[PDB]
Design an enzyme around this catalytic site. Structure first.
Site, PDB file in Angstrom:
ATOM      1  N   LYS A  36       0.747  -1.033  -0.142  1.00 27.05           N
ATOM      2  CA  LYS A  36      -0.130   0.160   0.151  1.00 27.05           C
ATOM      3  C   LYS A  36       0.925   1.241   0.115  1.00 27.05           C
ATOM      4  O   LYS A  36       0.799   2.327  -0.843  1.00 27.05           O
ATOM      5  CB  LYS A  36      -0.811   0.032   1.078  1.00 27.05           C
ATOM      6  CG  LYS A  36      -1.769  -1.090   1.094  1.00 27.05           C
ATOM      7  CD  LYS A  36      -2.937  -0.789   2.427  1.00 27.05           C
ATOM      8  CE  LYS A  36      -2.107  -1.026   3.548  1.00 27.05           C
ATOM      9  NZ  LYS A  36      -2.275  -2.416   4.006  1.00 27.05           N
TER      10      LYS A  36
ATOM     11  N   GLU B  79       1.029   5.604  10.988  1.00 27.71           N
ATOM     12  CA  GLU B  79       1.966   4.687  10.349  1.00 27.71           C
ATOM     13  C   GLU B  79       3.339   4.809  10.822  1.00 27.71           C
ATOM     14  O   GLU B  79       3.397   4.908  12.210  1.00 27.71           O
ATOM     15  CB  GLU B  79       1.892   5.080   8.826  1.00 27.71           C
ATOM     16  CG  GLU B  79       0.985   4.304   8.068  1.00 27.71           C
ATOM     17  CD  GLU B  79       1.443   2.876   8.185  1.00 27.71           C
ATOM     18  OE1 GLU B  79       2.219   2.213   7.839  1.00 27.71           O
ATOM     19  OE2 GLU B  79       0.234   2.294   8.824  1.00 27.71           O
ATOM     20  N   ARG B  80       4.507   4.435  10.158  1.00 29.85           N
ATOM     21  CA  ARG B  80       5.817   4.467  10.831  1.00 29.85           C
ATOM     22  C   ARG B  80       6.375   5.673  10.771  1.00 29.85           C
ATOM     23  O   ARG B  80       6.739   6.213   9.494  1.00 29.85           O
ATOM     24  CB  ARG B  80       6.612   3.323  10.125  1.00 29.85           C
ATOM     25  CG  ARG B  80       5.731   2.191   9.791  1.00 29.85           C
ATOM     26  CD  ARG B  80       6.238   1.141   8.977  1.00 29.85           C
ATOM     27  NE  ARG B  80       5.863  -0.153   9.313  1.00 29.85           N
ATOM     28  CZ  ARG B  80       4.971  -0.926   8.785  1.00 29.85           C
ATOM     29  NH1 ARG B  80       4.001  -0.064   8.012  1.00 29.85           N
ATOM     30  NH2 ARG B  80       4.653  -2.027   9.070  1.00 29.85           N
TER      31      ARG B  80
HETATM   32  N1  LIG Z   1       6.092  -2.336  -6.523  1.00 39.61           N
HETATM   33  C1  LIG Z   1       6.663  -3.296  -5.532  1.00 39.61           C
HETATM   34  N2  LIG Z   1       7.751  -3.941  -6.152  1.00 39.61           N
HETATM   35  C2  LIG Z   1       8.471  -4.672  -5.216  1.00 39.61           C
HETATM   36  N3  LIG Z   1       8.141  -4.871  -3.948  1.00 39.61           N
HETATM   37  C3  LIG Z   1       7.054  -4.484  -3.477  1.00 39.61           C
HETATM   38  C4  LIG Z   1       6.345  -3.317  -4.318  1.00 39.61           C
HETATM   39  N4  LIG Z   1       5.270  -2.872  -3.397  1.00 39.61           N
HETATM   40  C5  LIG Z   1       5.520  -3.519  -2.170  1.00 39.61           C
HETATM   41  N5  LIG Z   1       6.578  -4.440  -2.218  1.00 39.61           N
HETATM   42  C6  LIG Z   1       7.061  -5.236  -1.149  1.00 39.61           C
HETATM   43  O1  LIG Z   1       6.355  -5.310  -0.097  1.00 39.61           O
HETATM   44  C7  LIG Z   1       6.711  -4.641   1.173  1.00 39.61           C
HETATM   45  C8  LIG Z   1       5.826  -3.832   2.134  1.00 39.61           C
HETATM   46  O2  LIG Z   1       5.521  -2.703   1.014  1.00 39.61           O
HETATM   47  P1  LIG Z   1       4.531  -1.828   1.987  1.00 39.61           P
HETATM   48  O3  LIG Z   1       4.140  -0.826   0.863  1.00 39.61           O
HETATM   49  O4  LIG Z   1       5.226  -1.211   3.206  1.00 39.61           O
HETATM   50  O5  LIG Z   1       3.406  -2.688   2.413  1.00 39.61           O
HETATM   51  P2  LIG Z   1       2.086  -2.078   3.174  1.00 39.61           P
HETATM   52  O6  LIG Z   1       0.911  -3.055   2.841  1.00 39.61           O
HETATM   53  O7  LIG Z   1       2.017  -0.578   2.862  1.00 39.61           O
HETATM   54  N6  LIG Z   1       2.659  -2.198   4.981  1.00 39.61           N
HETATM   55  P3  LIG Z   1       1.481  -1.572   5.722  1.00 39.61           P
HETATM   56  O8  LIG Z   1       1.501   0.001   5.752  1.00 39.61           O
HETATM   57  O9  LIG Z   1       1.743  -1.992   7.281  1.00 39.61           O
HETATM   58  O10 LIG Z   1      -0.029  -2.218   5.523  1.00 39.61           O
HETATM   59  C9  LIG Z   1       8.097  -3.803   0.666  1.00 39.61           C
HETATM   60  O11 LIG Z   1       8.874  -4.004   1.656  1.00 39.61           O
HETATM   61  C10 LIG Z   1       8.265  -4.605  -0.745  1.00 39.61           C
HETATM   62  O12 LIG Z   1       9.339  -5.519  -0.743  1.00 39.61           O
HETATM   63 MG   LIG Z   2       2.969   0.865   4.634  1.00 37.71          MG
END
Ligand SMILES: Nc1ncnc2c1ncn2[C@@H]1O[C@H](COP(=O)(O)OP(=O)(O)NP(=O)(O)O)[C@@H](O)[C@H]1O
Ligand SMILES: [Mg+2]
Ligand SMILES: Nc1ncnc2c1ncn2[C@@H]1O[C@H](COP(=O)(O)OP(=O)(O)NP(=O)(O)O)[C@@H](O)[C@H]1O
Ligand SMILES: Nc1ncnc2c1ncn2[C@@H]1O[C@H](COP(=O)(O)OP(=O)(O)NP(=O)(O)O)[C@@H](O)[C@H]1O
Ligand SMILES: Nc1ncnc2c1ncn2[C@@H]1O[C@H](COP(=O)(O)OP(=O)(O)NP(=O)(O)O)[C@@H](O)[C@H]1O
Ligand SMILES: [Mg+2]
Ligand SMILES: [Mg+2]
Ligand SMILES: [Mg+2]
Lengths: 265, 337, 362, 48, 119, 337, 360
Positions: free
Chosen positions: F25, F51-52
């Site tokens: 996300k 968030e972080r």
């Molecule tokens: N376009 C992308 N390409 C490669 N890896 C990705 C991509 N998007 C997310 N990831 C992987 O997934 C992980 C988490 O991404 P992140 O956007 O922080 O997830 P998130 O759902 O926002 N976490 P949260 O805010 O707790 O729900 C990253 O550390 C990346 O390795």
């Molecule tokens: Mg996130």
């Protein structure tokens, strides 16, 4: 044993039971189609082999193994590969050509440097002479067929529908044919390579009959197997259904309690 | 066998038997009392918490007969009983009485004490029985909100200290056969070897009905049991874990759809599985066959041989409910006649 | 933050400043991962370069005392205690102390971060801290949340775990790195607390019982384990030869699921099956044996570039040590460059390439 | 083709819009493949 | 009973059979000498007193038995109520292929074809 | 590519990004900011709701380096932070803090705003954490009784009106990957376009983790995007839906047992799955692959082409992690070399 | 109540006074079904005959105001507003208003019912009304049950929907029909609220995103949708050429998995109708069909005049058939629209006109 899981768990079994029940009914129609080719091949086995009954022909061994590439049909390949090793005890160094992969895979693991050639793309439709001739041809080609002291084809014979039988049958070659006791009775004109042909064409014909019988024995097996799969996934569905309702039920009570306790305070 | 081989108990450690109703925690413990307690020399403290008075009356008969208890002689054991007929206060406490007695024998008289509790569950169940009337808001599954620390106070006392060793076996009951219920979940972290009884396994007639895959011990380490016993263990587990992974395909497709390597593992695992079952002398009135005791060196060799397929040619049944590997070759000759 | 755990340092590389969850069932090897990490820091703590050092703080929450004992013993058996601080709130202590420990501990190691150094905090384990924090509240009579927990059981952990960070140059560049532990039941990660922390941290390592019993130890679940920092915290050399491994290992489970159909394989699927099986096996590792980067690197390189692919599976065990033995003996000059430089230059790839082939022909 | 097959070219030149309803059109299409096998390892693939 | 194609088996009592043998046409009869002969690619016929019914064939084997039963086996096969332009357009492509191992197979087509034209 | 083809975002619209933890996300939303927030003539607010702290740190350092912020000159964005390091009350109002700043540019600067909220689920959660302390009986899944109306009371302010236009991108945490969790389940009604990230997708290495079927946007209607766009978009969907439906028969009876049209539909579906992934610029740390941005007309044309089979020869890998059909050809050859 | 939707009018016929429930997960098409019913009333509402008109009442509960705004902007774009009423209780309003709105609007409908006229009332949605009632109760600290709803949450909805009816001649014979919307979660019909409501209504129109992504819109699960009223409420003519339709599509659901090489001509045929038939019941949004426009297509379908046609052309088939029928057979169409039944002659008329178009 959460609800999320149990639900989807129970789905993918229903989805399996569907496929297996389709499989069964599809085999039923396919066995009807391969029933008529096992009567039209086991009859041409009559006219052919009768000559051999009158001139009683008695036989570096060439074993040809017959099945298919298809799994999901019980012990077709498993127990044919065993009768082939039972007979492969008495000649540890006998060459094999395999028709269908599942048998090749089986023997490849146990007499790994016996096999010299292999065929594939077989037990999909009913086998035809066109194939039965091309394999016979290639058996003549690379395998040096006639130049073999002995040849035997191994196939699954269909005894009923519920049961089949691993079986063997002898091919005889040019020399064996001339040398047969009552060959003298037959005023076959020695007018150029005449026993040769009879061999070259008893190799294709015999092979066909085996394949027709092998396939129609396999289809029966596939049918029966798929049938039991449906019975089991049937019984599994029943169990998980009961487990589902339990979990559902508790999900309701544990969820409710959380509220009641929150509410008394 | 299952313990010796898979989750070795430790001298002066904390052992626990987990299981639901009628899997056999009580009979299992009586097998341990049978072996260890006889050739132990030092003092024992048996504590009946929330069990059958029948059982307690039986255990008092049982001791006077082996001579552990000698009314006219000396005695090696002590009996404390807050049984399942007692009010929840009695049962919330009787184990602390047992403990105090053991703690004396450990700290004052510097002794090796064998301390059997059966059943320790019945202490936490009693805690909940009173808790609402004590005015407390309940907690998950309707347990006293103090369930963890009330256990920590009691469990943390049953221990070896620099003044005396204590080995303790405790019987753990498992409500509704649910291992994640908050009573047993919290127990585990207090033990040194944990050995679980599956209902399913007993319904297979496998006894002791241990879970070869759920049972653990801190002592299964090469530094302690040694590379071979270590490896005969792992390889046994891989075998069993594989059988387990296939339970589904075999359930629907059966055996004929397995490959060749898979197929073997299953026939082998089913043998290892039956071989893990052992006749118990105490449970004789249930098998009929007089009970057997295999040794540690005995067990490891036996299993290693099977894992080298040195017995593949033996009917699976031979491995069922017999002693060591010698007994397998015996029964197989008996049946092959 | 080099753990010396093949699977971890190639697949889920952890960074000085990041928070990284260790989650799995009971008796899966959660503590073991944390421990093997601490042990490793010896490599740097017996040195004199203060900024390469990593001081460890191990918080025991709800553990039995002897178990904290059994543990400090092992730390000492490994001369690992001189750079650790255990903070203990054992099973028997008051609910308030249990709930508090992680916070008090966070401060103990905040000292290091604030003062230009790097600590490592292991919270073993938050599931219990929450059990206890539940206990204060129910008894203080604050009305309960879900599974009788208090309403802000999330806030509880979030504020602790945010305290781990990697400071800027202006502030002394000190880091604090967190390895919380969490215990699940029946593999369910969708239960309250794990869910809470799972979304608080910069990634997780899932350990699994099934994996364990069939011989993958660490029983890391590659499929589910992530480090969200990613390659940013991997060593350049490890990064270089670990190109794509984690994705590949996924494709491997893919083909191995399709293998269950037991229908004939082609030269492409059999190919990746052979490599995945050997890669899997190459990541297995004994407890208490963290490996130097330069021991890890050539192993990974041998596996990835497929020099292991024609070697019996039971024998890959012996390959590993026999290989390392030879590399130390002969091409030590490489091993020491990898270490000193942390980056495989083009010629170093050459020497290594040669060096591996050489040995595989025995 | 062969002799073995002689009468399958004499039956497939003599195959080639009537009876070919399923039956014969399919008797003419065979989907087989052979492969020779050497020291485990194969040789190469080809249509029958 | 005894006259079989692999897909379709045909005949059963017979008064005269005509066959296209290895060396020229022949006729089996009520009692005949036990013989085997390669069956060349040509017409055949059955009899039941005065009954005329001619088939074409691909080739195969005939086998007159001591027990007196004649067995005739071929691959593919009514007379003109079976096989002109179907033949013609194919004959074109046949002759074409001959000018090309591959073109050797076409040699087989010319003889088999040329024969059928006569029917 | 996937948004603009299948679920295209609406100017003035509201746009939610659903996703369980760590499915991408925050990365996604940053890729949006990377693109949208340059080409945007007006102002933008970003709200960090629980968030972080470090994510926020990155953004502030990116803004400076993208140029979007300039501490000694003109800046195009306001930053409002209330991360998870902060107590519920604070985490429960900082959305409105941010949202007000937006409102002011909407209504009084009479102009275009872009409102970025990450993550809006923490507004609901924070509401959750104090609910009981304010003495409210819990509703279902232990959420506050006011979930619906509280979310309503916020979301309904985030809105294009006659005085000016807001366009908002809100990340939505989907707890336990459960979409039917009262919290996200409520949020759906509030958004013009829904981008659903999926763990199943992301686990295939397919980034962004967008679910092509469950993603929706009101604007996918011929009246808005033309018929051709709508037809391509529908067919792509039918394709993948079929390919999804057939994954039963593929597992059980292989790829072998298939109709020829089907065999091709699957061939095309797989090629399509990959062409929906794309290297983000933001995520270079993860792919080491340069960020590729694709023009909406280029998206539709290439999918159109793919769909009619004018690319059936090219191998699956050539569509994976590349930009437009140029890049499919480029890679196809570069690999065949 | 003629909705204009082929699938619904033909297979799930709604009667006046009935209570048909629209049900499915989010984003399946629930509102679209209702809105097409509303849009289809122009046929009569623009006419003269009172007993034949139908006034629309759309109760919007806890919707984004911009949605409502757009739903308005959509009926005005079809000149449907003039006979519709929107009671709006948007996302952001006090819970009491969201609790009240449906009863409030109920009483608006009854006006027409009580006055010898006919309304139909769409509750979008009851899920959200129940959520509202919940908010009030909990806050008032009324005691909670399953999912924290009060005991009388049933009684809430029973009261609402029992108000819908067909009144007797003595009462002016007016009528009120009900289209409550209910939102399942991951398809859970056992969910507390859906249970209550399903057991109050006379049937359900059932939606599924699966069918939706397949492209079958309206995404009506036929096997799961029932109208307890049924037969009695169908343009006799549509019921004439469709007693076979539920039959065919039933057997097509049972031989469906056979869509994957060696099927006998009987179960081959069954798959031949089914695909075409299913195709025939796809229908772009906002374009509801007149009865006299449905019955030809459903006729050519059921009686096997599409089996020849390929499955992709069934699209352009409908368009060209109807415009041709309009020019060259406007008279038969007129009889259907007027008589509402099919003569033995009319059946040969249509048959002939079809066989002519299918040949052409
Ligand atoms: N376009 C992308 N390409 C490669 N890896 C990705 C991509 N998007 C997310 N990831 C992987 O997934 C992980 C988490 O991404 P992140 O956007 O922080 O997830 P998130 O759902 O926002 N976490 P949260 O805010 O707790 O729900 C990253 O550390 C990346 O390795
Ligand atoms: Mg996130
Ligand atoms: N090792 C064994 N051998 C034979 N039978 C056994 C064994 N263990 C348990 N059983 C049988 O299972 C029954 C229950 O065993 P028991 O030792 O009473 O288990 P328990 O789990 O302690 N039951 P409970 O104390 O009521 O919750 C006995 O009657 C035995 O027949
Ligand atoms: N790499 C390894 N090889 C062999 N055994 C290991 C390994 N890692 C852990 N174990 C063992 O597995 C047992 C339990 O491991 P442990 O590290 O305590 O996991 P855990 O999740 O912390 N269990 P607990 O916290 O007590 O519920 C220990 O006896 C270890 O010896
Ligand atoms: N027959 C149809 N043909 C084409 N598109 C349709 C049809 N029916 C619905 N849609 C579209 O599909 C989407 C879902 O329809 P919709 O009426 O919003 O269902 P819904 O249950 O009311 N969704 P919601 O109530 O917002 O959770 C809308 O965006 C429409 O544009
Ligand atoms: Mg007992
Ligand atoms: Mg631990
Ligand atoms: Mg709607």
């Amino acid at each position: 044993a959460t609800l999320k899981e149990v639900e989807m768990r129970l789905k993918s079994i229903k989805n399996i039971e569907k496929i297996t029940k389709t499989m069964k009914i599809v085999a039923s129609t396919r066995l009807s189609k391969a029933e008529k080719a096992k009567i039209s091949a086991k009859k041409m086995d009559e006219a052919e082999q009768l000559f051999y009954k009158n001139a009683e022909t008695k036989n570096k061994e060439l074993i040809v193994a017959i099945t298919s590439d298809k799994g999901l049909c019980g012990s077709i390949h498993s127990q044919l590969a065993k009768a082939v090793r039972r007979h492969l005890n008495d000649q540890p160094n006998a060459d094999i050509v395999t028709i269908g992969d599942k048998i090749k895979m089986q023997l490849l693991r146990t007499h790994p440097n016996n096999i010299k050639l292999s065929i594939n793309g077989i037990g999909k439709d009913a086998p035809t002479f066109q194939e039965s001739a091309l394999i016979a041809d290639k058996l003549l080609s690379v395998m040096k067929a006639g130049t073999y002291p002995k040849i035997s084809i191994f196939y699954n014979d269909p005894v009923s529908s519920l049961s089949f039988e691993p079986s063997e049958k002898p091919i005889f070659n040019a020399k064996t044919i001339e040398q047969s006791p009552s060959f003298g009775k037959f005023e076959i004109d020695t007018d150029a390579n005449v026993p040769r042909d009879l061999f070259e064409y008893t190799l294709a014909n015999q092979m066909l009959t085996a394949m027709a019988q092998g396939y129609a024995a396999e289809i029966s097996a596939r049918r029966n197997a798929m049938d039991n799969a449906s019975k089991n996934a049937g019984d599994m569905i029943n169990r998980y259904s009961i487990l589902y309702n339990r979990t559902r039920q508790a999900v309701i009570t544990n969820e409710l309690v959380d509220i009641i306790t929150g509410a008394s305070s | 066998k299952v313990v010796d081989l898979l989750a070795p108990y430790a001298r002066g450690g904390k052992i626990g038997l987990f299981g639901g109703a009628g899997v056999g925690k009580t009979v299992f413990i009586q097998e341990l009392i049978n072996n260890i307690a006889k050739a132990h020399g030092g003092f024992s403290v048996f504590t009946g918490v929330g069990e059958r008075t029948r059982e307690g009356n039986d255990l008092y008969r049982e001791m006077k007969e082996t001579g552990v208890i000698n009314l006219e002689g000396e005695s090696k054991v002590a009996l404390v009983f807050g049984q399942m007929n007692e009010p929840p206060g009695a049962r919330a406490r009787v184990a602390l009485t047992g403990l105090t007695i053991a703690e004396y024998f450990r700290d004052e008289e510097g002794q090796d004490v064998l301390l059997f509790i059966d059943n320790i569950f019945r202490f936490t169940q009693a805690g909940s029985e009173v808790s609402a009337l004590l005015g407390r808001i309940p907690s998950a599954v309707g347990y006293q909100p103090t369930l963890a620390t009330d256990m920590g106070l009691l469990q943390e006392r049953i221990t070896t200290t620099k003044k005396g060793s204590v080995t303790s076996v405790q019987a753990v009951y498992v409500p509704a056969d649910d291992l994640t219920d908050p009573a047993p979940a919290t127990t585990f972290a207090h033990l040194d070897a944990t050995t679980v009884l599956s209902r399913g396994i007993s319904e297979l007639g496998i006894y002791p009905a241990v879970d070869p895959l759920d049972s653990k011990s801190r002592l299964l380490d090469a530094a302690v049991v040694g590379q071979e016993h270590y490896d005969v263990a792992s390889k046994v587990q891989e075998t069993l874990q594989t059988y387990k992974s296939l339970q589904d395909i075999i359930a629907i497709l059966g055996m004929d759809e397995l490959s060749e390597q898979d197929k073997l593992t299953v026939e082998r695992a089913r043998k290892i599985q039956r071989f893990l079952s052992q006749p118990f002398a105490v449970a004789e009135v249930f098998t009929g066959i007089p009970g057997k005791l295999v040794r540690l060196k005995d067990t490891v060799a036996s299993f290693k041989a099977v894992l080298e397929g040195k017995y593949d040619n033996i009917p699976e049944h031979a491995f069922y409910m017999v002693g060591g590997i010698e007994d397998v070759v015996a029964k197989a000759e008996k049946l092959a006649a | 933050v080099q753990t010396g755990l093949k699977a971890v340092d190639a697949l889920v590389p952890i960074g000085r400043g990041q928070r990284e969850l260790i989650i799995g069932d009971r008796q899966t090897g959660k503590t073991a991962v944390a421990l093997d990490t601490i042990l490793n820091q010896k490599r740097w703590n017996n040195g004199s370069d203060e900024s390469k050092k990593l001081y460890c703080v191990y918080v025991a929450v709800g553990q039995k005392r002897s178990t904290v004992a059994q543990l400090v013993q092992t730390l000492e058996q490994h001369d690992a205690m001189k750079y650790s601080i255990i903070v203990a709130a054992t099973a028997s202590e008051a609910a308030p102390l249990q709930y508090l420990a992680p916070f008090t501990a966070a401060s103990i190691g905040e000292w290091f971060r604030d003062n230009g150094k790097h600590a490592l905090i292991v919270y073993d384990d938050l599931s219990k801290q929450a059990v206890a924090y539940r206990q204060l509240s129910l008894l203080l009579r604050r009305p309960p949340g879900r599974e009788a927990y208090p309403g802000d059981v999330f806030y509880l952990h979030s504020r602790l775990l945010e305290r781990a960070a990697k400071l800027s140059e202006k502030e002394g560049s000190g880091s604090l790195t967190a390895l919380p532990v969490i215990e699940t039941q029946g593999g369910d990660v969708s239960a309250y607390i794990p869910t809470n922390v799972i979304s608080i941290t910069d990634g997780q390592i899932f350990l699994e019982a099934e994996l364990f019993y069939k011989g993958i130890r660490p029983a890391i679940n590659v499929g589910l384990s992530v480090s969200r920092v990613g390659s940013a915290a991997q060593v350049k050399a490890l990064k270089q030869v670990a190109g794509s491994l984690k994705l590949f290992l996924a494709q491997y489970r893919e083909v191995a699921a399709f293998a269950q159909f037991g229908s004939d394989l082609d030269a492409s699927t059999k190919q990746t099956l052979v490599r995945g099986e050997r890669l899997t096996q190459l990541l297995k590792q004994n407890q208490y044996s963290p490996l130097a980067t330069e021991e890890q690197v050539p192993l990974i390189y041998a596996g990835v570039n497929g020099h292991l692919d024609g070697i019996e599976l039971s024998r890959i065990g012996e390959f590993e040590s026999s290989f390392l033995s030879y590399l130390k003996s002969n091409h030590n000059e490489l091993l020491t460059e990898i270490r000193e430089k942390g980056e495989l230059s083009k010629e170093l790839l050459a020497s290594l390439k040669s060096a591996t082939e050489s040995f595989v022909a025995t | 083709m062969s002799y073995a097959a002689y009468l399958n070219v004499a039956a497939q030149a003599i195959r080639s819009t009537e009876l070919q309803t399923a039956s014969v059109t399919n008797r003419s299409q065979t989907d087989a493949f052979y492969t020779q096998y050497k020291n485990a390892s194969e040789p190469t693939p080809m249509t029958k | 009973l005894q006259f079989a194609l692999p897909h379709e088996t045909l005949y059963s009592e017979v008064t005269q059979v005509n066959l296209p043998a290895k060396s020229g046409r022949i006729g089996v009869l009520a009692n005949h000498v036990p013989t085997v002969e390669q069956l060349l690619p040509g017409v055949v016929e059955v009899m039941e007193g005065s009954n005329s019914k001619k088939f074409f064939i691909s080739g195969g084997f005939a086998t007159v038995q001591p027990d007196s039963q004649l067995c005739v086996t071929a691959i593919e096969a009514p007379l003109e109520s079976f096989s002109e332009n179907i033949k013609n357009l194919l004959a074109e492509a046949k002759k074409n292929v001959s000018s090309s191992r591959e073109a050797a197979e076409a040699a087989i087509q010319v003889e088999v074809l040329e024969n059928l034209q006569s029917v």
